[PDB]
Amino acid sequence: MKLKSFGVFGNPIKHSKSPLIHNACFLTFQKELRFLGHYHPILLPLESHIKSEFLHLGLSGANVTLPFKERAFQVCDKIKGIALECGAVNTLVLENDELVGYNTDALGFYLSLKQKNYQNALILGAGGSAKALACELKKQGLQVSVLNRSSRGLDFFQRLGCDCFMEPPKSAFDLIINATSASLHNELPLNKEVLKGYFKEGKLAYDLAYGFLTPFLSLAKELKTPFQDGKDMLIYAAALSFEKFSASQIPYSKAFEVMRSVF
Numbered sequence: 001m002k003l004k005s006f007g008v009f010g011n012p013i014k015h016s017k018s019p020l021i022h023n024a025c026f027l028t029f030q031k032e033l034r035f036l037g038h039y040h041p042i043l044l045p046l047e048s049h050i051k052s053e054f055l056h057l058g059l060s061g062a063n064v065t066l067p068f069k070e071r072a073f074q075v076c077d078k079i080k081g082i083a084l085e086c087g088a089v090n091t092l093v094l095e096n097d098e099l100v101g102y103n104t105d106a107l108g109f110y111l112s113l114k115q116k117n118y119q120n121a122l123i124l125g126a127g128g129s130a131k132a133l134a135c136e137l138k139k140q141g142l143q144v145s146v147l148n149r150s151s152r153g154l155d156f157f158q159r160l161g162c163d164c165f166m167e168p169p170k171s172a173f174d175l176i177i178n179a180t181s182a183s184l185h186n187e188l189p190l191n192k193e194v195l196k197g198y199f200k201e202g203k204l205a206y207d208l209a210y211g212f213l214t215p216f217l218s219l220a221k222e223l224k225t226p227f228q229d230g231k232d233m234l235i236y237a238a239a240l241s242f243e244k245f246s247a248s249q250i251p252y253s254k255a256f257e258v259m260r261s262v263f
């Protein structure tokens with residue numbers, strides 16, 4: 001049986017549930033794929049440029065998580081699909097010996113939303129996850145505000161047409177999104193009274209972290225604001241990545257069904 005190797009690059013990487021869900025798919029779909037994939041967690045040094053490792057490990061494809069998604073966009077040979085406008089890559093595939101970058105966070109976030117009744121959004125964060133979410137939400141015709149602590153990174157969000165803040169804007173937002181970078185989200189991302197204000201006027205508190213209740217979500221829950229963690233995004237984005245790992249042979253809906261079941 002033909003073997004191919006995949007993994008997910010991050011630091012930290014111990015928490016990632018990508019190997020669980022991708023391995024479940026590779027084991028089921030080996031029938032149709034006519035190879036058996038195995039998918040590994042891969043801890044990289046902070047300074048890594050990724051490509052050397054990808055090639056040394058003989059990977060066919062990989063995912064990229066914190067804090068490497070912007071670096072992946074820089075180091076891949078070719079960027080395809082909506083990643084062209086995300087400034088960030090979360091999926092790498094070796095295609096004809098070119099390292100090709102995609103971004104499945106954008107659509108995976110969109111698919112994860114139950115309602116499309118949302119008109120505007122405040123994204124907390126400025127890393128690869130925030131960039132893909134801003135791209136996607138602007139594409140869907142929401143107004144997007146982005147709140148962070150420095151002037152670095154602002155050109156991307158301003159070129160998208162986002163309203164960029166470093167002090168929390170006195171406005172109501174339908175979606176309030178914790179996409180803070182290089183963070184595990186164990187800590188409130190804003191002053192608690194400020195977040196309470198947003199939650200009381202907001203329609204959904206959405207936190208990209210998955211696999212525990214963050215204090216951000218717990219505050220929304222206490223306030224009876226509807227809230228959503230990162231599980232359904234992870235699973236849709238992973239299923240989309242799996243579609244790419246299959247050379248578009250297995251549709252994401254079929255990967256999704258397997259992944260959700262095992263998760």
Ligand SMILES: O=C(O)C1=C[C@@H](O)[C@@H](O)[C@H](O)C1
Pocket residue numbers: 008015016017018019063064065066090091105234237
């Ligand atoms: O936790 C994980 O395994 C992942 C989380 C998201 O950042 C993804 O975009 C990434 O591809 C994988």
